[PDB]
Amino acid sequence: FVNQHLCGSHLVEALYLVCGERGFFYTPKA
């Protein structure tokens, strides 16, 4: 479900789901 355009909360929810308990970092300004 990750091979599409994922923006904003849609991106953060894909990160939350794929990463699990490992957690993630969301740095929108790169």
Partner 1 sequence: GIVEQCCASVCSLYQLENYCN
Binding region for partner 1 (CB under 8 A): 2-8, 11, 14-15, 18-20, 22-30
Let me know: does 26 contact 15? Beta carbons within 8 Å.
yes
Distance CA 17, CA 3 (A): 14
Least distance from partner 1 to the Cβ atom of residue 21, Å? 9
User: Minimum CB separation from partner 1 for residue 11, in Å?
Assistant: 6
Q: Considering the complex, what minimum distance in angstroms separates the CB of residue 26 from partner 1?
A: 7
Residue at 6: amino acid letter: L
